[model samples]
Target: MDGSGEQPRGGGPTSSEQIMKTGALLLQGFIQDRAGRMGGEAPELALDPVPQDASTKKLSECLKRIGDELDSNMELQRMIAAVDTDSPREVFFRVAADMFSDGNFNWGRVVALFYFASKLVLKALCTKVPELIRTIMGWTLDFLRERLLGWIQDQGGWDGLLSYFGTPTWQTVTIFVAGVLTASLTIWKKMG
Candidate 1:
């Protein structure tokens, strides 16, 4: 192998990091697929980024929209505040469980709410919100684990779930990516 630190030139992911993001794209994409028809109101904010290069501009716009949405979601904030759990993780789960309507989990509404919470957490990373980082890390981990656990279990029994992770798949990649993104954000917060 060459001593250069660059990734191999096969157009494949060079580091575990990229590979995980790819997986998360797939995993989240699955939720997106299901939620696409879950029938919830669209996020109500629009974002405009100041002039920048294409990808960066697009990302900035997306982030702005997310932040705006979180800011506007007073109802969600109130609902969460009303939850009695000491941990944000439990509160999030309770909210999801409460979203079921007529014996069916309202995946659409839950996903929408989850996205709002994520945006809020991301915003908190940039500001000195009280107890924000400490609570967010635990909440994010719990949310991720439960979502995947329910999905995996629904697809198969314990053995099936075990086998799914043992093999390489986009779902696993997504899990890895989600955790990586969380860690990266925390590190970025620390660096500031």
Candidate 2:
């Protein structure tokens, strides 16, 4: 089934990657449609230039200089070529070697597939990290989207996420700590 609409015709099976991409597509559409209503979380980060300004400036420049480094990444090429959801191969098989699911929206499967994609994309950028740290990273993404992101849309702490990103913004110097809070709130909200 297409996450967008009318289902694709296939007598065989569906794939986790396809499912994940579908979910991501739906989530993306939802966000785009309601982004304005996503509303303010905290406050517009001060555009002030000083203490941390230098490093940020350097990164902004770096972003420009990279000049589409991903345009020719070999890892991305390999990862992409490995998957042939069109025929013969199932989407998930290219990665984990086996596929088994009950055939549903299955949130667990959705999350695992999303995390798998996230790691693969990160690796493609040559920014791959250790497994445990990567787990924390994926956990934080889901956590913020549910906890901080949701709260920002409703209660509070909108800019808190960004403020957490800004190390010198009177929050903890350790974004790792902010990440922890965001992640913990995420888990708490998931439980709720």
Candidate 3:
């Protein structure tokens, strides 16, 4: 065995191999980044602590109801996904997003922000489900959109971004070459 996992063509990695490796690494980092940072205060939110005298029984009830409904919806899709024939599973994922988006929440803006974060965390942890890689890639793009670009917009639109972080808050963070993957002139296809 050459131990190279490929015939000795005297060349390096292929374009397709690079794409797949890039995809896997991106997904892995997206998952682990939250695991590393989730314990800290949510700086972007900066929400005040819940009041001591506040009665959240109704809120708790609402949350429970949402969970129950989602549980049912997911059960149905899971059974369908498990069944044999080549039926499409993507629609289930599409509908699943709607299951929680507007029906179970009050504030659309805040609810969306919370849900986006919540779902990203969920997707990150679901390493066993290969079916989910496609779904999470779709979900992760949306998450990155909300976090990186829309984060500043949500603070106060484009006009207020500078003020949102305030003076001295903006600092440059350098990104070094995380890793190397193959590339090519004869670029053929895609990855998730």
Candidate 4:
């Protein structure tokens, strides 16, 4: 939107526009309201971004196309996206206006603001489970003594501790490079 406050002439939003500027505003408002809860990049909405002159079939295709694009980006069809932003007091409808009237989403490429929320995400905790599991045994044993009984065997039992840091899949990929580096360092130490 411009400070002038007048809707710019044409790409699609001017006259004979399929979506009213007001409706577009409403839609964007809804999306931004959603973003207020999500942090980071602008709220990613799954909109039916079809052109105005499109026939009903064309419009349906457009919606499906946009849906497909969103679908492809999601981690899995089952996982919902993270939404942890604060509500943007400013209008987002203009975004919809520009997007609809002028490759609305394309113009979205040039963003004006950036924000991040330090909200806690429990679900993201899943990624660390592999490491957590490896450490859990020592964690449990230590727990039984430290807090529970004010005793700890020795930290020596924790030799394999680092192994738990990288999961099997991550370990395999990380091991070769790491092994080469460690081997070289040990050889250098022996020569010295």
Number of the top-ranking candidate, with lDDT as the measure = 1
TM-score of candidate 4 to 2 decimals: 0.22
* Index of the highest-TM-score prediction: 1
Report clashes for each candidate as comma-separated counts.
3, 2, 0, 12
lDDT accuracy of residue 4 in candidate 3: 75
Q: Any runs in candidate 2 off by more than 4 Å, and if so which?
A: 1-120, 124-149, 154-158, 165-172, 175-192
What shift in Å separates residue 54 of candidate 4 from its native position after superposition?
7.0
Write model 2 residue lDDT over 43-131, tens digit each, in one string: 11212223232433433332223213432445433444444334212333332222112233212222233334433434332433334
Error of 3 at 107 (Å): 31
For each candidate in turn, the TM-score is: 0.33, 0.20, 0.23, 0.22
Ranking by TM-score: 1, 3, 4, 2
Each prediction's Cα lDDT score? 0.39, 0.33, 0.33, 0.28
lDDT per residue for candidate 3 within 126-158, as digits (tens), equals: 544444444555554454344433443333322
lDDT of model 2, residue 24: 32
Please provide, for model 1 over 1-192, each residue's C-alpha lDDT reduced to its tens digit, 9 standing for 90 to 100: 669876546532233333233223322332223223455454112122123324333333333444355435564444433434355565445544444434244232432443545544544544656256446544543554556345433433223322433455444533432333333233322321
The alpha-carbon deviation from the true structure for residue 99 of candidate 3, after best TM-score superposition, in angstroms, is 17
Q: Write the per-residue lDDT of candidate 4 for residues 1-192, one digit (tens) a residue.
A: 377676666542223222233223222232233323555453333233432432333323322343344335333222222222233112222221232243322211211111011011112224443232223223322333332222111212211222233455543523432233223223322321
In angstroms, give how far residue 141 of model 3 lies from its true place: 14
Displacement of residue 63 (Cα, Å) in model 2 is: 11
Query: Candidate 1 deviates by what RMSD?
Result: 15.3
On the 0 to 100 scale, the lDDT of residue 107 in model 3 is 20
